[model samples]
Target chain A: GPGSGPFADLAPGAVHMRVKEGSKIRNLMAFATASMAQPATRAIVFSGCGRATTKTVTCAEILKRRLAGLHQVTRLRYRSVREVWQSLSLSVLKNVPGLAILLSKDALDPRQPGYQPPNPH
Target chain B: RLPRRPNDIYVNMKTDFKAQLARCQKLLDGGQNACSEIYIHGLGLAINRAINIALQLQAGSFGSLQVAANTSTVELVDELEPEEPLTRIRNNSAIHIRVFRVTPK
Candidate 1:
């Protein structure tokens, strides 16, 4: 429990893309498609915090639905952030929940990580 | 030739949820002859409302309907009413949702 820093992805050359307040979900999806259809890029890790959580989920949903062969490894965690004050000129400590969606179009045999919630019966 | 769908709908920002749900149900009501998918699209901030209506349509259809969604970026150019003529090109978040009646096997 002492030396748990940022978790490393399984892929050595994976990319980490973060979703922010001004991030475009569709463009991020395009980037993932472009990155995967190349000989260089290995995998992609999409991170989202606070308001970006929904957008990140939207991106993941769109990607998994559109692309036929993609592997998704999901991780949910909390990120500690220090905020800057405008007029007060001080900082505040804030903790926000995050989602890590690791998507890769590789490997010999792909296995699903989880099961879909019982939505449609 | 641009072949438009029979049930093509554009989601508006106003409270058109009730009307949209009825429209979808009517399409499904007549879809017994030939299965047709409803294509619902909305740009920018209206994307969320588009998906909401699609799911609402499926919810009201019991287990007869299913909603599928796709998100994409589309560039829309707008003209501004300034002193002279001004224009701006911007990228808008777009959502394309499909609500179709599931056929029984």
Candidate 2:
């Protein structure tokens, strides 16, 4: 089959490797990159996704903790950090001088994007 | 009393500054023929200097609450020196960035 060229990400003569049971594929990819070695597999998804699920975490609890801190300062209540951050005053605070807010404050909706893997509970 | 610009009040911290003044110190330390890869680019010197002046308040150094009190002459940016060993057998370069955030403890 004729094609324009090799896929954008893969290099010529590179071997495509997949992870097996027990040992995670993503972790393998991480080790490859951190050690500055070429990954066995070209599809970073296998390695990156596997490593992400096994090793990375997004603690939704941080959301509530931050909102609690805000409530202490404002004598008010809010269900989530996403809420207070989106409030009108805070939105105006973005325009105020000397305020360097984080990216989460800029997200249209602070809720996590797309389908996230379930907690391991 | 002189009125201060609103943004000027946002003080950058004057930390104990430091610098790394060498381009090739690790090579001299007797490591490996990797030494051939290293060179006496220059003698390295790491230095630090403190910069804090009057005209401020007794604010807790916790979050962002420091103030420039009565006096108004603070010096930031003490010393900054950075070096990295790089090789280019081919004409290619790579860069990466990691993002982080600081939130209430």
Candidate 3:
């Protein structure tokens, strides 16, 4: 009774108590530091399980349908006209000393200057 | 080359076509959302392309098969351009790809 600082006269054991079963919660800094070391480790650790399914196709089938048969021909399989001029930058880098293949889309735009298309030699 | 029985191919064709129809019907009945709607549209295009190819093969349309012959210098381009509208009807980003022949090495 004398040892109690507050409520000394109220009833000896009447004080309400909160019990916590908990773990340490770290902040963004901790995660950022971990992510700096391991690219997506933080995300993988925190996120729930993810699943994916896909269909299978043969290489022969893709070749049969996807390719256009022509001599010295370049095919434009995918592109977004407004994405940027740099979208084809990587393609230019991939193949050297080759013509830049243009599909039905516009490769001739006088409005958009400062564009060095791939050499057609 | 001629086949022993053309009806066999026809029967398989109908079976595959029916399966596709049933799947489309199921998709229509199951859910209706922006994503599903886009997916169905894509599926419809793919099915139509496939059907067109099958029809071409069935009719022995050899005159249009010039690409298949003397195709040593052929380059195969196969990739999906998603989010780009097929026509200018929808307000969305459009994509264009061009091909040009290079000088001989």
Candidate 4:
């Protein structure tokens, strides 16, 4: 059963990223839930973890070591937890620009009354 | 289709509105039934109401609006009889799916 058991031929893109210990995943979830009732903020990132692991180390163990390198990365890349957190958070942030565009274009005001102001300012 | 001039909704509601209207008109002239209404649901009444208001504000030309709830009813133009009592919608655990086809213009 060492090599010939029922576990053969796993397809590519089959596994999702595994969270390391001390991640803000739960805090992020709480923030998302809180966002439903409060002013919501969405964030985004373009790049993903893309961590590489060797045969001798488990991917999770390798990931924790990689997570430790966040302090050594650029200030912009600093995050509360692993690179996975940054990737997840940044996707939400991307929508902000679009929403802002719509909001500013609408120029919602009751005082001015039916005015559609172009954003020249 | 090209956009319309301002404040022509009611007149356009029954007549051709956009430039594309003429195409639909030609199809209707060829014995096709032109469409006048569309239905949307699941989104809350507030959202629908907001969209409806926007459409009406943007109406400058054609578009008629109607909202329906389960208990609300409408009369069929043909000789169909009155509706039966609607079955109470279940709290959860049911799916109703339907498919229909319309000829391309």
Q: TM-score of each candidate?
A: 0.49, 0.14, 0.16, 0.15
| Model 4 CA deviation exceeding 4 Å by range | A1-34, A40-107, A110-121, B1-84, B87-105
Q: List, residue by residue over A1-121, the lDDT tens digit for candidate 3.
A: 5365222222222221111112112332243234424432211111000010000011111222233220111211111122224641333322111011111111333222112232232
Superposed model 1: Cα runs more than 4 Å off: A1-103, A106-121, B1-4, B31-35, B81-85
- Runs of candidate 3 with Cα error greater than 4 angstroms are A1-102, A105-121, B1-15, B31-35, B38-105
Evaluate model 4: give its lDDT.
Answer: 0.22
Instruction: Report the lDDT tens digits of candidate 4 across residue range A46-68.
Output: 11111211110122122223222
| Candidate structures ordered by TM-score, highest first | 1, 3, 4, 2
Q: Which ten residues in a row have the lowest lDDT in candidate 1 chain A?
A: A112-121
Better of 2 and 3 by TM-score: 3
lDDT of 2: 0.19
DockQ ranking of the models: 1, 3, 2, 4
CA-lDDT, candidates in order? 0.63, 0.19, 0.22, 0.22
- Categorize the docking of model 1: incorrect
Which residue pairs in model 1 clash with each other?
Answer: none
Give all candidate RMSDs, comma-separated.
Answer: 10.9, 24.9, 29.4, 23.3
Q: What TM-score quantifies how close candidate 3 is to the native fold?
A: 0.16
Kindly state the number of residue pairs that clash in model 3. Answer: 10
Quick one: best DockQ, which candidate? 1
Instruction: Tell me how large the interface RMSD of candidate 4 is.
Output: 23.0
| Residue-level lDDT for B56 in candidate 4 | 34
Clashing pairs in 3: A67-B76, A101-B98, A101-B99, A102-B97, A102-B98, A102-B99, A103-B97, A103-B98, A103-B99, A105-B96
Name every residue pair that clashes in candidate 4: A42-A92, A42-A93, A43-A90, A43-A92, A43-A93, A44-A90, A44-A91, A44-A93, A45-A90
Docking class for model 4 is incorrect
